[PDB]
Design an enzyme around this catalytic site. Structure first.
Site, short mmCIF file in Angstrom:
data_model
loop_
_atom_site.label_atom_id
_atom_site.label_comp_id
_atom_site.label_asym_id
_atom_site.label_seq_id
_atom_site.Cartn_x
_atom_site.Cartn_y
_atom_site.Cartn_z
N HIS A 243 62.47 5.60 -3.25
CA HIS A 243 63.82 6.02 -3.60
C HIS A 243 64.49 6.76 -2.44
O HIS A 243 63.84 7.17 -1.47
CB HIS A 243 63.82 6.90 -4.86
N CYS B 202 56.19 10.24 -4.94
CA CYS B 202 57.12 9.15 -4.68
C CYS B 202 57.26 8.89 -3.19
O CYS B 202 56.96 9.74 -2.34
CB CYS B 202 58.48 9.45 -5.29
#
Ligand SMILES: [Ca+2]
Length: 235
Positions: free
Chosen positions: A192, A210
């Protein structure tokens, strides 16, 4: 005897998918007896053209996914039989992302050719096509090594700290609006955009698991990648 009646299969007929997309079989009724699962797997034997080997994984009592051992051919029509049900789907380009925890990079290749966005003065960037500065999970919440596939793509999704085990109002909680979100695990791992994390990109692994990219790199990978495309995390 319709205990293994198949309600539906992914990919759907004619669907365009990334080159690691699993074959997801949804049963009409839960198969709650784990001992009956091997018979169910045989009744839903996956036969593709070109031939491919794979491994069954049960996602719920009524969903089993068949994970191909290798990538499908890009830009192709794959014929698919799931126990007599004859189907087919299409693959787009092979859009592969490889995250290196040690190098702090995310390398994107399209059909084998490393490529990234056209670069537009005070941030890390490599002179090597497709190699993006990245920040993986810190030692407390590391990004797990493995072979993943893109499960979904979302814009402007809100991510809480409850996904890694921290209430939002906790000493190190968070509630982020994330511009480009490429989901790679059902648990909540994403590639992301992380503009707040710009200083660490290419240098430090400061996320909570992440794969963090600049907004520009994330936007480019997001727009390139499809659900089903592979994502590799290496040390
Ligand atoms: Ca697709």
């Amino acid at each position: 005897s319709y205990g293994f009646a198949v309600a539906s299969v992914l990919p759907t007929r004619g669907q365009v998918v990334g080159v690691a997309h699993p074959v997801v079989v949804t049963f009409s009724a839960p198969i709650t007896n784990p001992a009956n699962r091997h018979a169910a797997e045989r009744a839903v034997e996956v036969k593709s053209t070109p031939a491919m080997t794979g491994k069954f994984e049960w996602l719920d009592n009524d969903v089993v996914q068949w994970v191909p051992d290798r990538f499908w051919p890009a830009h192709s029509t794959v014929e698919l039989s799931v126990g007599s049900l004859s189907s087919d789907f299409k693959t787009g380009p092979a859009v592969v992302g490889v995250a290196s925890i040690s190098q702090h990079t995310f390398t994107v290749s399209i059909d084998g050719v490393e490529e990234g966005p056209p670069p537009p003065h005070h941030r890390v960037h490599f002179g090597e096509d497709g190699v993006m500065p990245a920040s993986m999970g810190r030692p407390e919440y590391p990004t797990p090594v493995g072979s993943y596939t893109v499960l979904s793509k979302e814009r402007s999704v809100i991510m809480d700290s409850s996904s890694v085990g921290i209430p939002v109002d906790d000493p190190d909680g968070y509630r982020l609006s994330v511009d480009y979100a490429v989901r790679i695990t059902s648990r909540g791992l994403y590639v992301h955009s992380a503009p707040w994390a710009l200083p660490a990109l290419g240098l430090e692994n400061v996320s909570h698991g992440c794969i963090s990219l600049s907004r520009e790199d994330a936007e480019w990978y997001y727009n390139a990648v499809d659900i089903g495309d592979p994502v590799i995390v290496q040390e």
